[PDB]
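Q: Okay, next protein. This is xm63 from Peptide display vector fth1. I've checked the sequence twice, so it should be correct. Can you predict the 3D structure?
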Amino acid sequence: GCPPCRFTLSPWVSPCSNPHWPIRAMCNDSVPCPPC
């Protein structure tokens, strides 16, 4: 399964705008369920 982004530090907007934890995959959220 997809590793869960618990506390999106976005906080409510897209996970791509997330302070720290700079994973590109969750920023690719427009793609099928991407892993954090």
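A: Here is a summary of the prediction. Helices lie at 24-27. The CA atoms of residues 15 and 29 lie 8 Å apart.
Q: Noted. On to the next one.
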